[PDB]
RNA sequence: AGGGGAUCGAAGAUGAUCAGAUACCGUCGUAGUCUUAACCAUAAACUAUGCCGACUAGGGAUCGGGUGGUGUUUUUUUAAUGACCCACUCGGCACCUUACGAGAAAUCAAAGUCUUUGGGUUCUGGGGGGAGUAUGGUCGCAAGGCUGAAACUUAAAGGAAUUG
């Protein structure tokens, strides 16, 4: 797949790991 | 000269810069990391004596076709479990 | 080319160059007198002029100032020495 | 019976002559084989390697075969013959006749001392096919050739008793190293050490003092 | 070994200007060329025809001194060259080629072109390119009628010359055939303005 | 900007030698410069060399003859003890029965044989082949 | 199309190579010919052939032709070689340049002068 | 690998050139990496100039030609305009023709 | 190329080029030998001696073989001026 | 956060096309596009090519400075100028041909002067995937930026060139 929406692929991933942790902060 | 500084006076810079650059060395990383006390099954040890859990008939990779035959191991001096193949046609027949 | 001598080259050649890849350097400018009938001595003028140049007694003209060798005014001669 | 072409065909047929140092002397090229054969019947062969090629043609595949082969004495005289044809036995055969026409001298030496008979190379030589460089060391005696075996049998051939080796690059593609190593032991005549300092008088083309008892009819 | 009065005659010079062999290249000079004499306004540069005589001279000197004159190949791909190689050749031992140089010839034994020369003199570097090319492979010198342009790469002894056209390649070739009987050869003494016409060189016509 | 003087001095009469020529000019020669050629000519690697006056530092023309492969500077002078002259001229000399490492003794700048004979020990300069 | 294969015009080409102080023109005799003088296995080729050596024959005759040279014309080129009586020290002096003429006196002597200057 | 040592198109030492739209599709595209033809051509055409002074006032008129300058997209250049593909080395020639 | 008692060994020593003093071996085939041969009273080229001249193909192929010649053949005094040691 | 909001136009809605058609084409058009004040700090931000210095090779154009000329064109009365022409010299943006030389090649006046390995200096890389992920720190309004692992997996992944 297109590195460049690969890229928004982890980037997506990343800030919804970034909200289920702080949901425990 | 691209990039080593040659001059008399960089040593420091010199053996500071390798001392960096081994980290890309696996084996420099992994033995001060102590990834094998860390990391792995075996402490470190050269063997590892364990008990069978079960009995696993492993499917092989392609491009093979077969059954391999191994057993669940679980470390006396750890409890991590660690599946083991049995080599030498038979040889399941000789654990239990 | 291949060989030759670059101890003494021709002086055709070497005026050629530039002031510094002679084969020793030194200038290439000049200094001379000059003079407008007007008056009777001769003031010395460098051959680049940055300041434009006025004579003894009389505020007149000399040169004016160029990216380079001053152009002299209009009536006047000069010797180089 | 041979029939030559080429004045220096006839010539060293004619029995005018001796060695091909001659030929050397004066940079003469070989175009026939027979030369180097009169001029150095002693020459053995050795084939070093033999491996596949394939090319696709718009009708087909051609798997022709390409052999790698090396002759010398063991007095200072080497060949690199490298030829691919579509039999096995075909390519050794034109390859040992380009072997031939390669053939080159090579400068031993001393390797400490003044002593009898040089065993090693007058200098450090370095030759370079492809992307592997074969470094060619002067080595004491008894030494032996430090080399891969391939690199050690194109010198044996070439008549070194010692010498030290090192190489860079890939060396497992057999071809490139002993074009290199050909190259190396080659360039042992082109360096100018100070006893070559010395200057000779310049001698006479073997194609003029001969010219008569030469060229064509 | 300076002869005596193997000097350029005015005999001599004023053939050489009547050809215009001294009306060298334009603009196009390679850094090669100390054979030029000052330049004349508008694009043209003067030859020092002494250095052309004295290097002719040269030529003819190592042209014969080979022991079978028959092997010294005479060049011209050129038209203009083609009419004086051939009555160069005829003249003297020096097997010709004009028309198409056929690569491979000085390589390559098995070709019908093949020959062997201890020697090679060639009119336009550029056009005979080829020739140059091929007997740098196999040890062969290189005699060349070069102008101001010429690429000098595998000739030794150049015969600076004008073959923009005209008299001057069939001047040259006339002299470097004169020259070369007057050497070792069944010519004559001094002045000796010798019998054979210069026009019988020259490529002829339409 | 000019970390060793030596240093464009040798590459230069490098360049001279590999093109085919018969002479150099070199700049700003050196009292380093003189005493490196003067090794050279007087092992016969370069031919008579002629130090010009500029008001400046000076130039040189070198005149070449041809025998010399290479000439090259060791860049940081490192310090030899009369033992490892040995290694050096062991790693950059083409073979033991010639060429010179040259180096900068309390002795004065002399080639590495030179050094073995008057058992002196110092810096190293550069080498001559 | 009628377009003559390589063995034929390849041995034509041998034919009026070694043979031309023979054959001619007509084609019947040279036909004649090439059984006497050359083994062909065959009437058809050797008709073909020969019918193509008349053809080069019937054009070298005006003009020679490429890819045949018997050595017999390399001599009649030698024997055919003269032109001039003109030459090129008529009418008057050689009109030179001014270096032309400064060249002159540089290395030089008498030459007949005369000169001119020309211009961008 | 690298197949043009003039990259795209005629630039270097600026690093930015501004775009121009394509006549063809509208792509924008660099300036010295467009395609321009200058299209000179009369107004009329081959058949209409004889019935045009037939049918005109004045003698033999003026005609005024019609002068516009032609931006392609290369993909829209390729697909019409100067184009073809070149040989590896006929790319080198930027000879007109 | 002696060896330990004084007997040469170390066969076949090159030639030279005549510009630049370098090796020339056997497998420059680019490479020259000029033969110039010596004149007498009255024009005469006299076979059989010769004044010689090697050129290593290098110097051919960088385009130097001919300026390169007329020095060395001028020096040797078979040229009068042609080459000028100043540039 | 104000202003501006002609144009074009992420989003959205539509007309078509499609088996489907969340698209490509047509329409509408929000944000945006422009500006001020302040953030953000990233681009194939590319010459995918650190900087200073030296040396090694030819050629014709050209931009800027300068020098030389009983040069051309400008008429007036010669000039003065200006624009031009020709030669040289610095310092640029590039092209051309060479290849001594370099390279795995493509190619390269540097990507050269490198096993004949050392002018000065900064930085980055050490099989592929895991993954620019986790974690900590830090900066940001945010989007995100800088710093940045390992477990495990794996015999290739990859570069240039050749023939199909
Ligand atoms: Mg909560
Ligand atoms: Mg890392
Ligand atoms: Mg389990
Ligand atoms: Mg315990
Ligand atoms: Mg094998
Ligand atoms: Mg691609
Ligand atoms: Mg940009
Ligand atoms: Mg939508
Ligand atoms: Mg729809
Ligand atoms: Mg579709
Ligand atoms: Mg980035
Ligand atoms: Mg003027
Ligand atoms: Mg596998
Ligand atoms: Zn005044
Ligand atoms: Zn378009």
Redesign the pocket.
Known sequence: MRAKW??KR??????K??KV?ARSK | ???????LN?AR?LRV?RRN?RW???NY??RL?G?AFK??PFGGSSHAKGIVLEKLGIES?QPNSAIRKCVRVQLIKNGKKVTAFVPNDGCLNFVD | ?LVQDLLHPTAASEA???KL?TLVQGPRSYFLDVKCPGCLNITTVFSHAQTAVTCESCSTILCTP????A?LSEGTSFRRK | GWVPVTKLGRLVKAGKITTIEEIFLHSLPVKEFQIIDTLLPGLQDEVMNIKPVQ????AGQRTRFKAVVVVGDSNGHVGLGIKTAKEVAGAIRAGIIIAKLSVIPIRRGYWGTNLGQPHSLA????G?C??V?V?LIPAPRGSGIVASPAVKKLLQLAGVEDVYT?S??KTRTLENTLKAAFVAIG?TY??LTPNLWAEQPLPVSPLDIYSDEASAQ | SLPATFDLTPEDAQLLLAANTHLGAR?????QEPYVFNARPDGVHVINVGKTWEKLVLAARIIAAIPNPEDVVAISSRTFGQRAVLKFAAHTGATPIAGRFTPGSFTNYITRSFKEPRLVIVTDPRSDAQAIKEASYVNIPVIALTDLDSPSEFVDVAIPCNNRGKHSIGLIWYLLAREVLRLRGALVDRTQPWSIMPDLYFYRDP | ????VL??AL??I???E??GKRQVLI?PSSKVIIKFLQVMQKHGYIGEFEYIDDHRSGKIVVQLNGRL??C?????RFNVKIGDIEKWTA??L?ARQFGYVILTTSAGIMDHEEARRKHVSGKILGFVY | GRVRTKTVKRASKALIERYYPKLTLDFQTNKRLCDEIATIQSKRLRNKIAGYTTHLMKRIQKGPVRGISFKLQEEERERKDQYVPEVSRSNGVLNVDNQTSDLVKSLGLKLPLSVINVS? | ??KR???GRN???R?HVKPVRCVNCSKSIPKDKAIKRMAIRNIVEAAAVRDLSEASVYPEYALPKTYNKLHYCVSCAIHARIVRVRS?EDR?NRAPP | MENDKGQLVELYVPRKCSATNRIIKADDHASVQINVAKVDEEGRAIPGEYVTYALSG?VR??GESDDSLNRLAQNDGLLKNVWSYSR
Do not use: M, W
Request: proline share 4%; hydrophobic share 15%; aromatic share 2%.
């Open positions: 690969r890229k982890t980037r997506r991933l990343k800030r790991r970034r942790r | 000269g691209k990039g080593k500084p040659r001059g960089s810079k810069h650059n890309a060395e696996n990383k992994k990391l990834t990391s792995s990779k | 080319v050629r160059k530039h890849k160029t990216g380079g060798k152009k | 090319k696709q043609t718009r200098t450090k030589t370095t370079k492809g992307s460089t470094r090192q860079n690059g360039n082109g360096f | 603009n196009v000079q390679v850094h | 900007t000019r970390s060793s240093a464009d590459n230069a490098n360049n001279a590999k093109t700049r492969n290479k090259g500077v060791i860049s940081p790693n950059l083409p | 961008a | 690998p690298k040592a003039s990259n630039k270097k030492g690093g590896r080198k | 290098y192929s960088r």
